[model samples]
Target: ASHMQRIAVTAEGPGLDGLVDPRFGRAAGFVVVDAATMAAEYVDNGASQTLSHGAGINAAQVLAKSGAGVLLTGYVGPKAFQALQAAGIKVGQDLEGLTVRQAVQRFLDGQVPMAAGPNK
Candidate 1:
């Protein structure tokens, strides 16, 4: 059997059926999805509600523990990009106004491009 790639997407709500959030650092939470099986799990951002209080670092930590190899969202900052890269997580941006499920499919189908740096 082939090993599946797991992806984490910034979500407006829980589950793959919900919409994807445009902001990565400020997203409500994340829906971690398995690329092959399509299994998904929701994880809260769990960082300080205080504005910009290490949100990027915290999100990176969350992704690290989520066992996801990639991240999908609309926006990511320089600090967040650095943190994510350090966590060994690749990123795809400019995904918004779409369901988490659709975003995943878009990436798998080659519609989304892997991000080399922070988009916003």
Candidate 2:
């Protein structure tokens, strides 16, 4: 069996069925997908949401610690981007309006565009 790659999608709800939440730092939740089997798990971003600053960085840390090596989101800030980059996580952005599953499929199909830097 192949090893699964953890793919994190910024989400509006608790699972893959959730809508893609555009804001990375302030996302209400995250859907962590197992790339090999499409299995998913949800993680709430309540603490990150409550942060007054560095929310993006905090979210990045949460993802990194959760074993996610890739992230799909609509936007990423400079500090967050740097944190993810330093952790060897690949970030894909500009994926607004996509569902969690669709975003994962796009990533698997190599259709998702990789984000080069911070949007804000």
Candidate 3:
């Protein structure tokens, strides 16, 4: 069932080949990939990036609405972590580099560790 759900990664660009955005809350957008079919959707997160507060929480909301079951990002803070938990979205921590394509592949095989808590 792990590979059955869509995987959402903090993204810098528009496609699967796009690079990973290290900042979870301020990421330009999210690249959501259907692990089973490799289909991708780039969900814009513009609204959250500019907020004075709750950036992570708002971004988490965007992620939840995008229908992604798991999230992969460079880092996640506490409020966002809580938001994700409430939305039932799982976070795959570390191994975040190279490209969204590779990250998704690694996650496909269960190589990424499920993060226990927010980094800060």
Candidate 4:
């Protein structure tokens, strides 16, 4: 069973109560929530390791294995993007001021499309 309705949001911490993540690996936590159901499934996942410089590969692997449709993030590096793309996970980047669930809802509402983000 997969939460296709749910989209994963990355935060400096899973709570999203503290602060937003400046970068992908800076995220201390993550939440999987159904855009329609508004149900949030929280996961500690890991913060310390991810915040480090070279954690994208590992994170990508974790997310890919989880069968996520895509990720909503502040930014993404080429390496991470490539990894996620390899796993067939869509990447949404450079979003701000939206909660995890809120962003997913926006997508569900057709307000936003799954974006690959800025190219560099």
Q: Which candidate has the top score in lDDT? A: 2
lDDT assessment of candidate 3: 0.84
Per-residue lDDT of model 4, residues 1-120, tens digit only: 233555767765565344445456446656766566666666555843745565777777666556566677777777777876777777676555676656665666767656664342
Candidate 4 residue 100 Cα shift, in angstroms, is: 1.9
Which candidate order results from sorting by TM-score in descending order? Answer: 2, 3, 1, 4
Q: What TM-score quantifies how close candidate 1 is to the native fold? A: 0.91
lDDT of 3 by residue, 13-119 (tens): 69878788888889999998887776788899888888999999999888877777899988889989998888888997664565998888887787888888997
Whole-model lDDT values for every prediction: 0.85, 0.86, 0.84, 0.63
Give per-residue lDDT, candidate 3, residue 92: 78
**Mind giving the per-residue lDDT tens digits that candidate 1 earns over 1-120?**
112298899988797788999988778999988887878789887562345577887888878887788998999999999988888888999898889989999999999888999987
How does each model score on TM-score? Answer: 0.91, 0.92, 0.92, 0.74
Ranking according to lDDT, highest score first: 2, 1, 3, 4
User: What is the alpha-carbon RMSD of candidate 3 to the true structure?
Assistant: 2.3
lDDT tens digits by residue: candidate 2, 82-107: 98887778889988888888999989
Error (Å) of candidate 4 at residue 15 is 4.2
Error of 2 at 105 (Å): 0.5
- Evaluate model 2: give its TM-score: 0.92
Colliding pairs, model 2: none
